[PDB]
Write a protein that holds these residues in place. Sequence first.
Motif, PDB file in Angstrom:
ATOM      1  N   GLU A  29      -0.186   2.522   5.028  1.00  0.00           N
ATOM      2  CA  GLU A  29      -0.103   1.254   4.379  1.00  0.00           C
ATOM      3  C   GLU A  29       1.342   1.013   3.526  1.00  0.00           C
ATOM      4  OE1 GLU A  29      -4.133   1.616   2.269  1.00  0.00           O
ATOM      5  OE2 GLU A  29      -4.472  -0.210   3.689  1.00  0.00           O
ATOM      6  N   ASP A  55       1.332  -4.699   4.833  1.00  0.00           N
ATOM      7  CA  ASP A  55       0.845  -6.035   5.201  1.00  0.00           C
ATOM      8  C   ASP A  55       1.825  -7.150   4.557  1.00  0.00           C
ATOM      9  OD1 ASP A  55       0.636  -5.916   2.116  1.00  0.00           O
ATOM     10  OD2 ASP A  55      -1.462  -6.030   2.151  1.00  0.00           O
ATOM     11  N   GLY A 332      -1.813   4.324  -0.540  1.00  0.00           N
ATOM     12  CA  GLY A 332      -2.580   3.844   0.214  1.00  0.00           C
ATOM     13  C   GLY A 332      -3.371   4.833   1.019  1.00  0.00           C
TER      14      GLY A 332
END
Lengths: 346, 343
Positions: A29, A55, A332
């Motif tokens: 992540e 992301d 993450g």
Amino acid sequence: PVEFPKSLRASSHSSEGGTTKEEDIYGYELLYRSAFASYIAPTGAWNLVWFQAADGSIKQARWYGEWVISTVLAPGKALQGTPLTALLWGPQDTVRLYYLSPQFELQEWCWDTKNGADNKYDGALNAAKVKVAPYSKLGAVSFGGANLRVYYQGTNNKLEEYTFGGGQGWKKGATLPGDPLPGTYISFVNRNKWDANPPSIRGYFQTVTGSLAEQVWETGGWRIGQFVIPAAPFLTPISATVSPEKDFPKIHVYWLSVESTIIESVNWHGWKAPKQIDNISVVKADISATSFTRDDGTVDVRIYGTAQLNVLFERIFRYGVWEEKIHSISVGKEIPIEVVGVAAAL
Amino acid sequence: PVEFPKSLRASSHSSEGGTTKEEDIYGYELLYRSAFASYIAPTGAWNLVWFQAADGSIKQARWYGEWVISTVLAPGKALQGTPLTALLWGPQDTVRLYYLSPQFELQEWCWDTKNGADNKYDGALNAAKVKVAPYSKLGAVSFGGANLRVYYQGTNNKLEEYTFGGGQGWKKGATLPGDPLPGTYISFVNRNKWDANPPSIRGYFQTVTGSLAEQVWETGGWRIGQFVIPAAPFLTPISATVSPEKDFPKIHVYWLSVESTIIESVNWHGWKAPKQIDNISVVKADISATSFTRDDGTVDVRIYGTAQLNVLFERIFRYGVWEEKIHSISVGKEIPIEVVGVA
Ligand SMILES: O[C@H]1[C@H](O)[C@@H](O)OC[C@H]1O
Ligand SMILES: O[C@H]1[C@H](O)[C@H](O)OC[C@H]1O
Ligand SMILES: O[C@H]1[C@H](O)[C@H](O)OC[C@H]1O
């Protein structure tokens, strides 16, 4: 397992002569080869590190006895793979983070905490709609309080300055000397104190010949400095930091060797020879150095970046030594993967 | 100069034992570590290659006697760093290019040239708004004409299929077996002819252990195949291609060694041992292989990717050998830089 060059060390627990067989961590992540910006408080009390998540959101790791992860910019605010650079002044209650929009325009994130405030907001730089080269990196300095300078690469590949202060708003500043490599990493520092005016500005970058070079601003204007590294890896990450040691500015300049180990050059009453700080190969990707001066006049350094396989590392220079413990900061979900040292293609 | 590891060769004009001193090219209008997709015409008459420019637009390099560069997707359409994968059928008048939006949704670009038309448009896959893992790569196959399959990594890191055909529009397809590495490169091929039905599908990917693995579809469903590479570099680029040789599908699977040299494994009446095709270190970044069967029955291969320092290379397998002088396709402004090997 995954294969790694046998002659290189992937981690602190690699064999002395290179990688044999070990376990390393993939934090998936964290954006692979994320940019990093960082600032340690001038008191040394706390640390801020910014990075890009997979992301595309921009996140913050804050250390104050422990690391805490938060999100400062939602997905869609920043270019995927944006550069990052940060400012801190007040002496330590006013924070700025510079990044690129997905349209390659300079953007500014502001965090104001003076008088007990906790205000995050978009900065006025966004309204200037300053288009930069799509591969531009970013640097910045502050002086005299809130006089700000943002450094970027223009579409013709020159390094460029944008300025803020004196009630003028954001305005185009100097075009800097030299012939920068397109996409060069850049790192700018102010050798003078945050509330002093004029500043003493140094910028480090890679030229079209592959050498490392130095931008210098003193009263009288910009010039190319005496720091010269004749050869460095192509698009090597670069990060510099400065803090006074025994009342004289100590510059640390970091870049990567062909082995992707971290090389350090110190300026303190002259430049010292470059030196590898440890023999562990990091991921060839952005690094971020920061520093502060203790009450006794000695200078601590922290370096953040990507370690094998994809983890946020912290390297610590404290009380005159690089600590052997290299930390990792989880951001993450993670998977452990076996790594084997391999000597040939097949 | 820039420094390069002395034991590695940066170019086909590097010294035999590694890099000593040489001049290499930085094409700075090619996105550093661009994705690549490609398709050579089944006749070999022309070549299509797609890549991402530095400004994020998706561009096309078309070979027809000479290379010509054009823009197919304006800046802003694609994620910076988008994966790319392409389809070609009709036998060769219908083109699809799959990519990711800046919001990590599957997107489709369409180029129809039947009957001399020149229709370029956004495809219907965009309407499904299929959100994928942000580091997902892309694969795709076509069969029976316009039956399409797009492969991607879902948010739980499984490999997933989206389907088109039979008047159904785009629908979610299978969830594939195996345990894929988050962010794995992926490459899917159809061993049967573009107009044949059913297809014979193979996919190649990297697992959470670092091994390389194979997806197999025949009638009855998906299974993990026999192709197994126990160890490969972390997030190694992967690209496969297939074309018939002596009326049997010849699969070529390519990935990068620990020295960033290209390794090839061939399946043609069984898997052959992996072989390094040349000892020149490319940039560890996406590659794209394509192939066709020459009218003399032999199978030609082309591989595209990033060579030192940042150029679009073409490697050519033709008449049974890899040509040794590897050229580049210019896509914009360039600067030459001296490279020195350092120990
Ligand atoms: O790896 C093999 C596979 O197991 C078989 O099913 O077809 C040919 C190859 O793809
Ligand atoms: O761009 C401005 C910002 O709006 C903030 O108010 O302080 C100074 C600059 O960072
Ligand atoms: O998504 C569709 C596209 O809109 C076009 O109709 O051709 C078939 C598919 O690629």
